[PDB]
Design a protein around this ligand. Structure first.
Ligand SMILES: Cn1ncc(C(=O)N2CCOCC2)c1C(=O)Nc1cc2nc(-c3ccccc3)nn2cn1
Ligand SMILES: [Mg+2]
Ligand SMILES: [Zn+2]
Length: 313
């Protein structure tokens, strides 16, 4: 009860910033997550022993793929931690609990392939879930882990608080399906511009939490340039493995996934910052002004990708 997690001074300070990198020491990531739950939520949100057991079952159910791995889970949760801490009074007690957990869990048992590849390969998961295929799988793995003995970190919630939190987590994990992001942000755009956005409207909250999820999920583009650049290598390592597998099914992959079109990467990064990232963090900054450093950091990394194209690196 009187047992805080604490971090070394450089981490204690830098973890509060949006651009924090959780570092290469895997064995510290659990402690970092618990630190964030404790400051974001309270030392009383979760029975420490249940939390620690839940975190380690989550780690065990992430695979050793280049990008969609246990480091991604904690990175995405840290971005959420930063949004929640800079927007203290906008979120309920249940939202704070459920969203860090949602982010830790959002890519559970990912294999490093897209929903399209599952559908072209005819994976069983693609018959069980016709849209948002991996994301319905991730929520389903979260429920599984929550129902292992000693793993129910929400035990102390009421029957209806319990259902409201599992419903927040579900919507939060579905929203990480980038196919849903485009419409979700268009609507958030119109609602904010016509002045109809209303955070007491539960369907409005849902959309705003969905946009936060997309922001946290993409937060590689909001890091210091060397983090951004070295993360992009892990991303393409998956994309190109997927492209190889497409070719094995006798399908020309999209260029994003063709290792034979490495030369086009800098321009594809621009497409991505302009079509997805920048619009994402813009609308997020409009709705939640203290998240502006994500937008500023994204625009800086766009400008570093422009330099790469110009041969200035
Ligand atoms: C940087 N970042 N962060 C997250 C993600 C991301 O898409 N997520 C969703 C999928 O799951 C993985 C993560 C990315 C990223 O890089 N997206 C990305 C890279 C890219 N390259 C090209 C490209 C097109 C033609 C020729 C050569 C390259 N198009 N293109 C479009 N998007
Ligand atoms: Mg995902
Ligand atoms: Zn993800």
């Amino acid at each position: 009860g009187l047992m805080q997690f604490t971090l070394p001074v450089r981490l204690c300070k830098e973890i509060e910033l949006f651009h924090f990198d959780i570092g290469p020491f895997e064995n510290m990531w659990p402690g970092i997550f618990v630190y964030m739950v404790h400051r974001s939520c309270g030392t009383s949100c979760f029975e420490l022993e249940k939390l620690c057991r839940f975190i380690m079952s989550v780690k065990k159910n992430y695979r050793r793929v280049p990008y969609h791995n246990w480091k991604h889970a904690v990175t995405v949760a840290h971005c959420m931690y930063a949004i929640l801490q800079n927007n203290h009074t906008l979120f309920t007690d249940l939202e704070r609990k459920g969203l860090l957990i949602a982010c830790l869990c959002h890519d559970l048992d990912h294999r490093g392939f897209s929903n399209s590849y599952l559908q072209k390969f005819d994976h069983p998961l693609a018959a069980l879930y016709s849209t948002s295929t991996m994301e319905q799988h991730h929520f389903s793995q979260t429920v599984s882990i929550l129902q292992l003995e000693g793993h129910n970190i929400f035990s102390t919630l009421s029957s209806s608080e319990y259902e409201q939190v599992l419903e927040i987590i579900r919507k939060a994990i579905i929203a990480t399906d980038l196919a849903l992001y485009f419409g979700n942000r268009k609507q958030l755009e119109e609602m904010y511009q016509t002045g109809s956005l209303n955070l007491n409207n539960q369907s409005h909250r849902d959309r705003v939490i969905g946009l936060m999820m997309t922001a946290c999920d993409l937060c590689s583009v909001t890091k210091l340039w060397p983090v951004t650049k070295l993360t992009a290598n892990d991303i393409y390592a998956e994309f190109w493995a997927e492209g190889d597998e497409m070719k094995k099914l006798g399908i020309q992959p999209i260029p994003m996934m063709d290792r034979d079109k490495k030369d086009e990467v800098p321009q594809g990064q621009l497409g991505f910052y302009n079509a997805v990232a920048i619009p994402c963090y813009t609308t997020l900054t409009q709705i939640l002004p203290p998240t502006e450093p994500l937008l500023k950091a994204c625009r800086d990394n766009l400008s570093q990708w422009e330099k790469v194209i110009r041969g200035e690196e």
